[PDB]
C-alpha cells in the first residue's frame, strides 16, 4: 500500500471547492446541445448594457415616474436640475441597474462608467444642458461655476436626442470597495450634476415640462471581484408552497 | 479525487517503520560536517577488536584480579590450568567483551572467533601451554589426552608473548541462537581448555606465579542478526534528577 | 481504488507545515504588483544596518540620555570610560538594536559584528581613544595595560568623526546559543572597553563634556538560525478594543 497522512482541511466541505464527484447515473447520455440565441459566458457582457437610473427616487414619484426627470423652463440662469449619487453599494439611483445589480454580488470594482441621457420632449423643444462629473474630495457642487471645473459635456437637444457622460476611472487604488462607509476614500466615486447651460425653450403647443431618461452602463475596462451574496434579496421565513415540495 | 481504501496496519505506530516525517523547523541549516577521527559505520567494526575476558570470574578475585589467570610451577605433568565457557548469551567470561556486549543486542550469530592470550610473567619465565578448542557434543575435557584431540595450539613463551587460538565456525546451522538453553544444539559452541604442555619454569628471582591475560575478538566472517534489547541494562525506577527535567 | 494506510502524524496540525490548501475564492484575480521601494527578501539585510546602542543604560539617564556616553577631560592617564556587555540574548546595550531585535527571534548566531562610534563634540575638541575587544575567558579588563592585549583600535578625533571596531568571530563552535547562562562557554562573546589613549582636550569655549554615540551592525558573514518567539513582547490580557472586533 501507499503510505499517506491526512492534512488539515481533510473531510471538510468548502462550498467553493472544485473537485470531481460520483455520477449518480452511470452511462447517462445528456440531450444534444442546440444553438440557443444569446449565450452569456461572462457577467461583464451583461454589465455593459445600459439600463435606466431612478434619478427621481423621491416621494410623490410613484412607480414609473421615478424613471424620468421632469425639466421645465426657468427664469434664472445657471440653475441646477438634478444630481446623481454614484455609490453602487448604497441604495441610490444606481442600485437597480444592470451595472448596479451584478456589482452587488461583488465587493471590489474598477473601470469606467457611462451615463446616457435621452431627451424625451417634443421636436419643438430646444435647450442646452451641462452634465458634470466631479472627482471626490469635497461637497457636491451646487452652482454651475463650481461644477463645470470637473469632467463635463455640454449637450444641445437636436437631431440626436442623446449624449454620453463618460465617468472616467479616476482612483488612487486599482479597485474601489463596496464598503458601508459611503464617505470613505476607498468607496466614494464622486458626483454627477446637471445644470441649465441655456434654458428649456418650448413654443405654446409643446408641453412646457419635458423629460429626461438616464441610463448607465459599464465600459469594457470594467472589472468586478471578490464575490459575496447580494443584499438585494433575502427571506425571514420559508416561501409559499415550499412545504408542499415535501408533501 | 483519488479513490482510496485503508489497509490493515493503517494508523499504527511501529517503532521500526522507515518513513519521512514533518520538519519541525523549516529552512533550518545544520552545522557543516567536520572530519572527526574514528567513524563507525557498522557495528562489526567494533566487534573485531580484542577485549579482555574475565576468565577468573571466581570469588576472592576482586575487581581487576578477575581479568588475569595466575599460573604456577606444578609438580605433575599434563595439568589443567583453566577452562572458558563459550556461551555469549550466558553470563560467563565472554559477556563483558566488545564481541560479547554487541552480540547481546542480537539473537543470532555466526562466524569465527579468536582468543588471544598474552603472557605477563618475567623475561626469565619459560613454559609451554596447549590451548584446545573442543566442538560440542560431550562434556568438557578434563585431561590433556582427551582435550588435544580437538583444535589446539601449542605455545612457547619467548620473544613473542602472545598466541591466537582461532575458534573456527564449526556449526550445522548457518547461525547459532542466543537462547536461554545453554545445552541446546543450536546454542552450545563448545569448550576452550588450557593445559601445561611442559611447565612454567622460573628462576629464584622471578616471581614464581605468573599471569595470562585472555582477549577475544571476532573475525571478519562474523555476522549478527535479529536485533533485541540487551539484558545487560535495566531499571525498576526512574533515575535520579529525571523529575528535575520536568521542573 | 488505491490501497493506502495512514502514518503517524496523520491529521495533525503542525504550525510550520508547508502544504497547499483550498482556495476560499476561486478565480480571484489579485491586484497587479507595483514596484514599491525598499523590498526586504532576507532578514539579514536588516541586521547589517547600524543602530544605536544604549551604552548609558543607567539610572538618572532618562530617555534619550541613554543613547549617548558623556566623556570629559580627566586628570589621570589610562582611564576607563565605558564598557559594553556583548550578550545579545541578555538585556544589555545590544538588545534594542536592529541586530539585537532580529536575533532574539532566533536561538543560534554566528558572524562578525561592528561597533561604530561617532564623536559628537565640537570641532575644537581633540582627543584619542582606544576601543578594545577582549575574547572571553576571564574578567572584564579594568586597566588599559590589560585591555589593549586584545583586539583594539586607536582613534583620534579629527576630520572623520567615526571609527569601526570590528568584533571578530572568534569562537570554538560554528554558532553561539542564546541560552540564559550568560557565563556559558557557548554564549559569552567577550567584552568591549573604551579607554583614554590621550585625553579629551577642549578650549574654554567648547563645552567641556563631549558625547559619543555607539552603533552596532552585523557584517555579511553573519548568520542566524533556530527560530523562536521573541521575549521582547508579550501579553497577560487581551488588548483594548479586541472585544469590539467581535461586536
Amino acid at each position: 500500500g501507499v503510505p499517506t497522512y491526512l492534512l488539515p482541511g481533510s473531510g471538510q466541505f468548502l462550498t467553493t471547492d472544485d473537485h470531481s464527484s460520483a455520477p449518480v447515473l452511470p452511462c447517462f447520455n445528456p440531450t444534444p446541445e442546440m444553438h440557443i440565441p444569446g449565450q452569456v459566458r461572462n457577467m461583464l457582457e451583461v454589465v455593459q448594457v445600459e439600463s435606466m437610473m431612478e434619478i427621481n427616487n423621491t416621494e410623490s414619484a410613484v412607480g414609473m415616474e421615478r424613471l424620468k426627470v421632469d425639466i421645465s423652463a426657468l427664469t434664472d440662469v445657471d440653475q441646477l436640475l438634478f444630481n446623481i449619487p454614484l455609490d453602487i453599494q448604497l441604495d441610490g439611483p444606481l442600485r437597480n441597474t444592470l451595472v448596479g445589480n451584478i456589482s452587488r454580488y461583488y465587493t471590489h470594482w474598477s473601470g469606467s462608467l457611462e451615463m446616457t441621457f435621452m431627451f424625451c420632449g417634443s421636436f419643438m423643444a430646444t435647450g442646452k444642458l451641462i452634465l458634470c462629473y466631479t472627482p471626490p474630495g469635497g461637497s457636491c457642487p451646487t452652482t454651475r461655476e463650481t461644477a463645470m471645473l470637473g469632467t463635463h459635456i455640454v449637450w444641445d437637444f437636436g437631431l440626436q436626442s442623446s449624449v454620453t457622460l463618460i465617468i472616467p476611472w479616476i482612483s488612487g487604488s486599482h479597485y474601489r470597495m463596496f464598503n458601508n462607509d459611503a464617505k470613505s476614500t476607498n468607496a466614494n466615486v464622486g458626483y454627477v450634476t446637471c445644470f441649465m447651460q441655456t434654458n428649456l425653450i418650448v413654443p405654446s403647443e409643446s408641453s412646457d415640462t419635458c423629460s429626461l431618461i438616464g441610463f448607465i452602463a459599464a465600459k469594457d475596462d470594467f472589472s468586478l471581484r471578490l464575490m459575496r451574496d447580494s443584499p438585494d434579496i433575502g427571506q425571514i421565513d420559508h416561501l409559499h408552497a415550499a412545504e408542499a415540495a415535501y408533501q | 479525487g483519488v479513490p482510496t481504501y485503508l489497509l490493515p496496519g493503517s494508523g499504527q505506530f511501529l517503532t521500526t517503520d522507515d518513513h519521512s516525517s514533518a520538519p519541525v523547523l523549516p529552512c533550518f541549516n545544520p552545522t557543516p560536517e567536520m572530519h572527526i577521527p574514528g567513524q563507525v559505520r557498522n557495528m562489526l567494526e567494533v566487534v573485531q577488536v580484542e577485549s579482555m575476558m574475565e576468565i577468573n570470574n571466581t570469588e576472592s578475585a576482586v575487581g581487576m584480579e578477575r581479568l588475569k589467570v595466575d599460573i604456577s610451577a606444578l609438580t605433575d605433568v599434563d595439568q589443567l590450568l583453566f577452562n572458558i565457557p563459550l556461551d555469549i548469551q550466558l553470563d560467563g567470561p565472554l559477556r563483558n567483551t566488545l564481541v560479547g556486549n554487541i552480540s547481546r543486542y542480537y539473537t543470532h550469530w555466526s562466524g569465527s572467533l579468536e582468543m588471544t592470550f598474552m603472557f605477563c610473567g618475567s623475561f626469565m619465565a619459560t613454559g609451554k601451554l596447549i590451548l584446545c578448542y573442543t566442538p560440542p557434543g560431550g562434556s568438557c575435557p578434563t585431561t590433556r589426552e582427551t582435550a588435544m584431540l580437538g583444535t589446539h595450539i601449542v605455545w612457547d613463551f619467548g620473544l613473542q608473548s602472545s598466541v591466537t587460538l582461532i575458534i573456527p565456525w564449526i556449526s550445522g546451522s548457518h547461525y547459532r541462537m542466543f537462547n536461554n538453553d545453554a545445552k541446546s544444539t543450536n546454542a552450545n559452541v563448545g569448550y576452550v581448555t588450557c593445559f601445561m604442555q611442559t611447565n612454567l619454569i622460573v628462576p629464584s628471582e622471578s616471581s614464581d606465579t605468573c599471569s595470562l591475560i585472555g582477549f577475544i575478538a571476532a573475525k571478519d566472517d562474523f555476522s549478527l542478526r535479529l536485533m533485541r534489547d540487551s539484558p545487560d541494562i535495566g531499571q525498576i525506577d526512574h533515575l535520579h534528577a529525571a523529575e528535575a527535567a520536568y521542573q | 481504488g488505491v490501497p493506502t494506510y495512514l502514518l503517524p502524524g496523520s491529521g495533525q496540525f503542525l504550525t510550520t507545515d508547508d502544504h497547499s490548501s483550498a482556495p476560499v475564492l476561486p478565480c480571484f484575480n489579485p491586484t497587479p504588483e507595483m514596484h514599491i521601494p525598499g523590498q526586504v527578501r532576507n532578514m539579514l539585510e536588516v541586521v547589517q544596518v547600524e543602530s544605536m546602542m544604549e551604552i548609558n543604560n543607567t539610572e538618572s539617564a532618562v530617555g534619550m540620555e541613554r543613547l549617548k556616553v558623556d566623556i570629559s577631560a580627566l586628570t589621570d592617564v589610562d582611564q576607563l570610560l565605558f564598557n559594553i556587555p556583548l550578550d545579545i540574548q541578555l538585556d544589555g546595550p545590544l538588545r534594542n538594536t536592529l541586530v539585537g531585535n532580529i536575533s532574539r527571534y532566533y536561538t543560534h548566531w554566528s558572524g562578525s559584528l561592528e561597533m561604530t562610534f561617532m564623536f559628537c563634540g565640537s570641532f575644537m575638541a581633540t582627543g584619542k581613544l582606544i576601543l578594545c575587544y577582549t575574547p572571553p575567558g576571564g574578567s572584564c579588563p579594568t586597566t588599559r595595560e590589560t585591555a589593549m592585549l586584545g583586539t583594539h583600535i586607536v582613534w583620534d578625533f579629527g576630520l572623520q568623526s567615526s571609527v569601526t571596531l570590528i568584533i571578530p568571530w572568534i569562537s570554538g563552535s560554528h554558532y553561539r546559543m542564546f541560552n540564559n547562562d550568560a557565563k556559558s562557554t557557548n554564549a559569552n562573546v567577550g567584552y568591549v572597553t573604551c579607554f583614554m589613549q590621550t585625553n579629551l582636550i577642549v578650549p574654554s569655549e567648547s563645552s567641556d563634556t563631549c558625547s559619543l554615540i555607539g552603533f552596532i551592525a552585523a557584517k555579511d558573514d553573519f548568520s542566524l538560525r533556530l527560530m523562536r518567539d521573541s521575549p521582547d513582547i508579550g501579553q497577560i490580557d487581551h488588548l483594548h478594543a479586541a472585544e469590539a472586533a467581535y461586536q
Partner: peptide
C-alpha cells in the same frame, strides 16, 4: 483529477474566456 467513467462527473470548467457583448450592446443591423 477525474477517475470516473462519465464526463459530467468532472470538476468545473473555468476556462471559457470567449465574450461577445455586441449581441447585447449593438444588436442593430447597420
Amino acid at each position: 483529477i477525474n477517475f470516473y467513467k462519465d464526463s459530467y462527473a468532472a470538476s468545473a470548467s473555468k476556462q471559457d474566456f470567449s465574450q461577445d457583448p455586441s449581441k447585447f450592446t449593438e444588436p442593430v443591423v447597420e
